[PDB]
Amino acid sequence: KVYKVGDIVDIKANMPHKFYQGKTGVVYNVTKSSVGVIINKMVGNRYLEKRLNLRVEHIKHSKCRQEFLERVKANAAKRAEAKAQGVAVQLKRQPAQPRESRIVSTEGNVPQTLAPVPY
Amino acid sequence: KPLPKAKAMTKWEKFAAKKGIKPKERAGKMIYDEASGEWVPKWGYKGANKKLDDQWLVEVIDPRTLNRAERKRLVKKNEKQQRRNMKN
């Protein structure tokens, strides 16, 4: 783990002193013994930046921008195919949908009735 | 050997005595830390001074090293003042 000026990291302390503990910011300095991050804090209804100076081992890289890249590459593939042929490809995602009709079967599964228990 | 006598006022015993600064009671060496809940020697084991050294974030060059330097400057100034007084 070696960090560069500008990358993104999250704070994770391995007690009662201070708790950001799970925010996400950009490295704006890398000194020998530590690293420095900035964090936009909601000062009432404004975003004013605090410059925190963490240590080395209390910070790790982030994967909050891996799915975007992987999906853009999968979309490159899908669009290569959609130009290779005349195909409706429907790249857009979709929110989870309501289910459809079904027919359950009580052959090896007879419904067992159960009542609530006492005290 | 002659009898022992060495009466220097070191300019602190002069300043403190022109006005009415009395000495301190010299009761104890512990303070009370609030979060945590221990008695944490003020100097004598992980003294409250050497705490900004291992703090897990400082909230603003590394500020902890600058703090160490600023402490060392006062230590060396105290030693120099003592040497000057002893030379007087």
UniProtKB/Swiss-Prot annotation, chain A:
GO terms for biological process: cytoplasmic translation. One of its GO terms (cellular component) is cytosol. Keywords: Cytoplasm, Isopeptide bond, Ribonucleoprotein, Ribosomal protein, Ubl conjugation. There is a cross-link at residue 1 (Glycyl lysine isopeptide (Lys-Gly) (interchain with G-Cter in ubiquitin)). Component of the ribosome, a large ribonucleoprotein complex responsible for the synthesis of proteins in the cell. The small ribosomal subunit (SSU) binds messenger RNAs (mRNAs) and translates the encoded message by selecting cognate aminoacyl-transfer RNA (tRNA) molecules. The large subunit (LSU) contains the ribosomal catalytic site termed the peptidyl transferase center (PTC), which catalyzes the formation of peptide bonds, thereby polymerizing the amino acids delivered by tRNAs into a polypeptide chain. Component of the large ribosomal subunit (LSU). Mature yeast ribosomes consist of a small (40S) and a large (60S) subunit. The 40S small subunit contains 1 molecule of ribosomal RNA (18S rRNA) and 33 different proteins (encoded by 57 genes). The large 60S subunit contains 3 rRNA molecules (25S, 5.8S and 5S rRNA) and 46 different proteins (encoded by 81 genes). Belongs to the eukaryotic ribosomal protein eL21 family. There are 2 genes for eL21 in yeast. This is Large ribosomal subunit protein eL21A. It comes from Saccharomyces cerevisiae (strain ATCC 204508 / S288c) (Baker's yeast). The chain holds residues 32 to 156 of 160 of the full protein.
Swiss-Prot record, chain B:
Disruption phenotype: Depletion causes defects in processing of pre- rRNA and assembly of ribosomal subunits. Residues 71-88 are annotated as: Disordered. Transmembrane segments: none annotated. It is found in: Nucleus. It comes from the Eukaryota. Component of a hexameric 5S RNP precursor complex, composed of 5S RNA, RRS1, RPF2, RPL5, RPL11A/RPL11B and SYO1; this complex acts as a precursor for ribosome assembly. Belongs to the RRS1 family. Required for ribosome biogenesis. This is Regulator of ribosome biosynthesis. The gene is RRS1.
